[PDB]
Amino acid sequence: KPPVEKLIEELRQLKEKAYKGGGDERIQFQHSKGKLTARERLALLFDDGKFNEIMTFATTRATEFGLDKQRFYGDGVVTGWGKVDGRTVFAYAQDFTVLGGSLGETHANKIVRAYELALKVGAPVVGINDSGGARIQEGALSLEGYGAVFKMNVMASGVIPQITIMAGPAAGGAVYSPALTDFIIMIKGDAYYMFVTGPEITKVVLGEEVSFQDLGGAVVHATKSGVVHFMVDSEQEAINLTKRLLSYLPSNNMEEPPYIDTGDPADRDATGVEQIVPNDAAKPYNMREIIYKIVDNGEFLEVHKHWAQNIIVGFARIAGNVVGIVANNPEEFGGSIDIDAADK
Amino acid sequence: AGGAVYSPALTDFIIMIKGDAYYMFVTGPEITKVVLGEEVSFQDLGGAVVHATKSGVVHFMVDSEQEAINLTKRLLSYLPSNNMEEPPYIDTGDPADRDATGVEQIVPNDAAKPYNMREIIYKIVDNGEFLEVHKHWAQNIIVGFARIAGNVVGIVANNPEEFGGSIDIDAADKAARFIRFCDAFNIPLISLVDTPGYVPGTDQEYKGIIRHGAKMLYAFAEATVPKITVIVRKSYGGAHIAMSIKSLGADLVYAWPTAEIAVTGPEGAVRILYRKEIQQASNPDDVLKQRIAEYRKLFANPYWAAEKGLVDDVIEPKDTRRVIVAGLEMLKTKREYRYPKKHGNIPL
Amino acid sequence: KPPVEKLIEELRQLKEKAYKGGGDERIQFQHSKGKLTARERLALLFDDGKFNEIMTFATTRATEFGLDKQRFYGDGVVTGWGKVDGRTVFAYAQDFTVLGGSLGETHANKIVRAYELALKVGAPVVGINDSGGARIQEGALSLEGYGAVFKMNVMASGVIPQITIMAGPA
Numbered sequence: 001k002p003p004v005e006k007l008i009e010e011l012r013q014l015k016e017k018a019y020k021g022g023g024d025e026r027i028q029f030q031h032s033k034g035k036l037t038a039r040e041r042l043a044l045l046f047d048d049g050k051f052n053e054i055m056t057f058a059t060t061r062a063t064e065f066g067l068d069k070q071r072f073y074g075d076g077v078v079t080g081w082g083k084v085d086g087r088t089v090f091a092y093a094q095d096f097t098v099l100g101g102s103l104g105e106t107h108a109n110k111i112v113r114a115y116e117l118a119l120k121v122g123a124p125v126v127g128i129n130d131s132g133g134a135r136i137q138e139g140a141l142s143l144e145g146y147g148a149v150f151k152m153n154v155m156a157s158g159v160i161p162q163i164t165i166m167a168g169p170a171a172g173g174a175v176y177s178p179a180l181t182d183f184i185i186m187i188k189g190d191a192y193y194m195f196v197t198g199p200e201i202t203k204v205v206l207g208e209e210v211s212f213q214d215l216g217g218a219v220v221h222a223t224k225s226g227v228v229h230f231m232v233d234s235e236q237e238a239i240n241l242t243k244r245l246l247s248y249l250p251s252n253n254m255e256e257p258p259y260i261d262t263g264d265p266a267d268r269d270a271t272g273v274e275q276i277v278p279n280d281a282a283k284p285y286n287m288r289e290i291i292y293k294i295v296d297n298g299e300f301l302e303v304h305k306h307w308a309q310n311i312i313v314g315f316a317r318i319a320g321n322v323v324g325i326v327a328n329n330p331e332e333f334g335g336s337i338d339i340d341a342a343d344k
Numbered sequence: 345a346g347g348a349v350y351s352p353a354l355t356d357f358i359i360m361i362k363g364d365a366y367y368m369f370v371t372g373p374e375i376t377k378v379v380l381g382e383e384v385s386f387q388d389l390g391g392a393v394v395h396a397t398k399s400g401v402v403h404f405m406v407d408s409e410q411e412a413i414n415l416t417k418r419l420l421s422y423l424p425s426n427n428m429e430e431p432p433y434i435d436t437g438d439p440a441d442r443d444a445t446g447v448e449q450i451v452p453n454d455a456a457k458p459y460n461m462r463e464i465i466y467k468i469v470d471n472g473e474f475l476e477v478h479k480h481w482a483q484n485i486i487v488g489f490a491r492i493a494g495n496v497v498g499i500v501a502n503n504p505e506e507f508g509g510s511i512d513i514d515a516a517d518k519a520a521r522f523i524r525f526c527d528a529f530n531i532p533l534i535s536l537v538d539t540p541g542y543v544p545g546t547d548q549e550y551k552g553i554i555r556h557g558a559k560m561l562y563a564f565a566e567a568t569v570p571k572i573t574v575i576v577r578k579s580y581g582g583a584h585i586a587m588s589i590k591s592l593g594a595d596l597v598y599a600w601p602t603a604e605i606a607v608t609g610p611e612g613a614v615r616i617l618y619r620k621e622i623q624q625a626s627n628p629d630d631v632l633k634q635r636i637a638e639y640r641k642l643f644a645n646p647y648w649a650a651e652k653g654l655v656d657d658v659i660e661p662k663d664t665r666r667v668i669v670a671g672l673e674m675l676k677t678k679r680e681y682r683y684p685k686k687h688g689n690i691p692l
Numbered sequence: 693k694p695p696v697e698k699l700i701e702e703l704r705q706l707k708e709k710a711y712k713g714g715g716d717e718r719i720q721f722q723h724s725k726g727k728l729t730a731r732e733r734l735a736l737l738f739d740d741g742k743f744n745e746i747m748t749f750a751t752t753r754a755t756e757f758g759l760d761k762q763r764f765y766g767d768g769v770v771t772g773w774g775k776v777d778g779r780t781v782f783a784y785a786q787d788f789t790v791l792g793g794s795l796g797e798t799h800a801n802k803i804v805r806a807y808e809l810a811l812k813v814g815a816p817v818v819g820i821n822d823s824g825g826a827r828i829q830e831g832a833l834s835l836e837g838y839g840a841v842f843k844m845n846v847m848a849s850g851v852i853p854q855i856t857i858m859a860g861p862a
Contacts, residue, residue: 063755065617121684134581136617139607140649143584147591150558154565157688172608173582179558179691196557196582201612202544216549223670225552305689343692453694506793595809596746601699611703641693647706653798653805656794657748660700670744674773674780677813 015342018056018073024056025052030096033191035167036235038078041128045239046082053080054117055110062105064135072098074122075106076112076131079114081123084246087119090118093128102135105176108145112229115152125226126242127314130168131179146173147314153180161249165238166228169212170194183303185230185247188218223306226340231306240299244301248315248322257322263297284330287312291325294318303344310341345578347373349401351645356525357419359404359412368545370402400514402483406503422489422496424529431531435470437494443467443665451602452663455577461486461536463526464576465499468492468665474499477522482514484543487522489531493669498526500587501536504507504577509539511583513548513556520559527567532672535594537587538577540609542566562690565593570597570675575646575655586592590654595678596671598664599646599655610639618667710748710765714789722788730770730785733771733820735784738774744770746809747802754796757829764790767798768823771806773815783812785820787862793823796830800837807844816853822860 001007019039027037036044042051056078059071077097081090092111094101111127118125135141152197157164162181168191170178178184186192195216203209214220222231230245232238250257273293276285292298295316304313309332313326328335341344349368352358360367369390376382390392395402404419406412424431447467450459465470469490476488484506490497500519502509511519526533542553564571564586573587573594584605588594599605607613614635624633640649649655659667693699693710693836711731713719719729728736735741751763768790773782784803785794803819826834 010356061753063760064412068755122581134607136607136613139643140584140605140654141652142607143581144589144591144652146582147585147589150561150585151565154688155683156560157562158685158691159683175554175583176558176561176582180562182633194554196542196553197544197548198612200615202546206545210546215546216554220546220550221554224550225554227552227554236615285599337420448696448700451696453696595812601703604695645748650747651751651752652762653747653750653801655749656746658703661705667744674744674809674815675813679814682813 008316009334014057014073017130020312021072021074021095023228026097032143034189035096035099035130035191038095038103038128040234041165041167041239042078042082042091044236045242046089046124047127048082051078052082053078054113055079057068058106058110060104060106060138061136062135062141064139067137067223070099074098074211075110076101077107077110079110081117084243087246087251088121089124089126089246089251090114091126091128094130094168096130096132100133100136100138101131101168102133102140102144103131104135105138105141105145107135108142112148112152115149115156116146117235118160118318119152122160122254124163124246124249124251125156126163126246127163127177128165128167129170129175130173132169133171133174143173143322146176149177149242158253159248163245165235165242165243166194166218167215167235167238168192171198172196175218179227183229184221184224184227185214185232185241186218186221186228187232187235187238188222194218196220206302219232222304224237224271224342226304228307245315247339248301248317250253259320262320264319269293282334284334286331287327287329287335292314295323295325296320308338308340308344310336310338311344345369353401357403359406359415359419360392360395360402361409361412361529363407366390367392367395379643396478397480400478400517402481403477405480418475422531427529430532431496431529433494433496435494435586436632437470437491439470440493440555440669441615441666443662445662447664448600448602448661451577451600455604456548458508459504460505461509461538461576464536465490465501466575466641468668469499470494470498478518481670482512482518483512484512485506485515485519486536487519490666491681492534492672495672496531497534497668497672498522498531499503499534499536502539502583502587504538507543509578510541511539511557511560511586512543513551513553516553516556516560523560523563523567527563527569532570532675533567533572533574534589534641534668535571535575535588536586537575539578539580539583539587540578540675541581541583552588553677558580561592563689564588566688566690567593568678568680570595570678572668572671572675573580574668575605575692577602577604577664579603579605580606581606595675597655597660598662598667599649600645600664601658602661603646603658604640604644605646605649605655606639608645611636614639706765707748708734712729713764713766713787715769727822729786730787730820733857733859734770734774734783734785737775737818737820738781738818739778740817743770743772743774745770746751746788747771747819750798750802752796752798752830754830754833756831759829762791766790766798768793769799769802769803771802773806773809776790780815781818782806782815783818783820786822786860788822788824791827791829792825793860794825794827795823795834795837797833797837799827800834801840804840804844807841811844811848811852814852817848819854819856819860821856821862824861836842 004124079092085263092319164178164181166186193212221228312327366386373384396405475492486501622631750763771784
């Protein structure tokens with residue numbers, strides 16, 4: 001093989017091959033469920049038109065169960081970094097079309113490598129999940145892979161913001177890395193859910209029969225378990241939300257939350273606010289109305305909105321600077337604090 | 345009652361005497377009588393029994409004040425005075441060489457038969473002494489203090505007699521808290537493994553097993569004190585990882601010849617794995633549970649893992665004490681890097 | 693298989709086989725050259741010849757060039773720690789009877805793991821070298837393996853004493 005001109009043409013073909021993941025048929029299948037592909041989600045998230053991928057051709061090294069034949073470039077996950085609103089952030093996007101987005105050993109190390117880089121340079125990491133779980137074909141090495149990523153989640157905990165977009169059907173170990181990150185944004189729908197143990201086992205073991213959505217759909221986690229922090233209707237909304245969430249956070253624990261969009265003035269009001277609180281000491285009112293009245297342009301990104309409405313917490317800006325707010329909600333439990341609320 | 349319960353909650357251990365001179369609750373029953381009409385006695389609401397067996401607020405339940413004080417002194421004996429101190433050494437640990445056999449006798453014929461995991465730890469540690477923490481709560485996991493060759497150790501062991509050693513939400517809370525404590529106070533951690541995974545059902549998902557379970561993962565990954573895992577039998581899926589493996593930070597990993605480390609239970613694995621292949625094979629029933637035997641023969645062992653380097657060595661049960669003693673003596677001066685932060689954001 | 697008493701039996705056989713490395717035919721060849729085997733050197737170095745070994749059964753992951761056939765336990769190197777004159781010391785001893793003691797990926801990762809443990813614990817490391825070089829059959833993965841060892845040597849430089857015994861055709 002001599003000419004370089006032919007060499008570059010070969011590269012272009014190989015990359016175009018790698019980009020297809022599991023193939024046009026499978027991506028159309030992903031699309032027919034209402035989901036976007038791993039790469040389409042990334043292009044939406046990053047200042048469109050740019051993503052720096054690492055270990056793009058990396059494949060699996062397993063040989064058992066035919067894995068010696070199924071060598072998909074990238075091993076099921078896209079990893080790298082880009083700019084989100086001009087700021088550097090890292091991300092991984094699992095490709096469900098590549099062996100159900102299962103967690104391969106090489107698949108895990110690519111994610112781990114992203115976390116190691118984000119930790120070295122102090123940049124956030126958003127994991128766009130879409131994995132059925134461990135790659136059973138790789139046995140114990142698959143679990144070890146999970147362990148390695150969990151390790152990175154803990155080391156990065158409180159050092160660099162960690163946001164997960166749960167955009168798939170997570171079971172078993174695929175559930176824990178998200179638990180270890182700071183915020184879980186999940187889309188509600190038939191195609192999205194997460195649980196440690198699937199329904200099939202709860203049957204033979206427990207004896208109880210339940211649907212995937214009733215066991216771990218977006219609604220159960222955003223309204224009962226407290227596992228999900230933000231529940232949304234679509235993937236486009238999930239990524240717009242992540243962009244908004246990131247806008248309130250520093251790139252790492254060595255930076256102050258970014259100052260932003262004017263529109264203060266800082267001189268408060270004079271009326272309204274004092275009219276909200278009832279005469280009685282027990283009658284409910286809208287605590288959220290008081291927050292909107294206090295913060296810049298009344299904007300409030302509410303965390304755990306649908307879980308334990310018992311208390312309210314979220315982000316906002318006051319005269320351009322980021323603040324976190326914790327406020328008792330009279331409308332639920334009379335503002336009485338509770339187990340779920342204390343956790344939230 | 346009220347504010348009087350929170351300081352104790354914030355401390356590391358609560359020893360409570362069982363008796364009518366009540367105990368604790370954030371809000372008394374009085375309010376429940378005014379609004380509704382469900383009279384509840386002090387004991388039923390916050391008795392030592394409810395807190396040691398249900399809420400997990402109480403770590404030790406005793407029958408008298410003299411017992412609470414004696415236990416306090418005993419607990420103190422396993423603890424260093426502070427942060428910069430190493431736990432206190434004691435009874436001239438001579439019996440460091442080889443564990444008394446019979447240990448491999450505790451584990452039954454097939455993994456279908458249970459056994460008392462404490463029987464195994466009694467044989468491993470000094471004089472069989474073990475101070476069990478949270479003894480009557482989340483019994484599917486065993487957690488407590490002991491001495492090995494004179495040095496204090498913290499143990500986290502699955503209990504085959506409760507929920508089949510499967511980890512629960514309460515168990516994860518129990519084990520994770522005990523792990524963070526030991527680490528903060530330089531107490532080495534020994535993990536004894538025999539768990540099929542986590543307890544299933546909406547009941548567990550609805551109450552957030554996803555976040556409670558991650559607490560164990562966080563605790564071990566966080567800990568920098570010496571950590572050795574001894575896999576006695578089953579070690580499946582997430583449970584396997586939650587007990588401490590190399591990628592999560594285990595310094596040394598050992599397995600008895602009876603260990604079975606599987607990515608998933610050997611059935612749940614074949615039922616997602618085998619179908620297109622076998623659903624069409626010689627026999628329609630044979631090949632239905634025949635490959636379930638296949639997996640086990642091919643993976644329900646520790647050797648596959650040992651070949652992958654995931655397990656440092658396969659040892660004879662009898663050797664467990666010596667292996668621990670050697671490993672702990674070698675890790676005594678262990679030091680590990682952790683990234684600067686005010687603190688982490690452990691799931692709650 | 694239900695007898696645990698039979699499992700302890702298998703273990704002892706498997707280990708008996710792992711201690712053999714390349715086999716009696718290879719060990720006699722090593723001996724014919726006037727050299728000891730990896731384990732004999734370690735028994736001489738450590739008090740009472742005792743050594744706590746790590747990753748005893750670890751084998752190559754490679755498949756190309758018949759490596760899916762030649763999968764010896766330990767992948768050509770014995771790694772672990774022990775005491776010499778009562779002090780904790782870490783060490784690796786390459787086994788020439790296993791693929792010319794060449795540096796396979798797993799083989800390199802056992803040496804790296806030893807160095808990580810020694811460096812984390814403040815113990816010296818003794819390297820009884822006896823290998824012809826890179827394991828050609830594992831290609832660039834073997835080179836990657838070397839770099840990982842070299843990195844450990846550098847991090848450990850001036851932190852822990854590093855002594856190497858050159859006992860082979862490097």
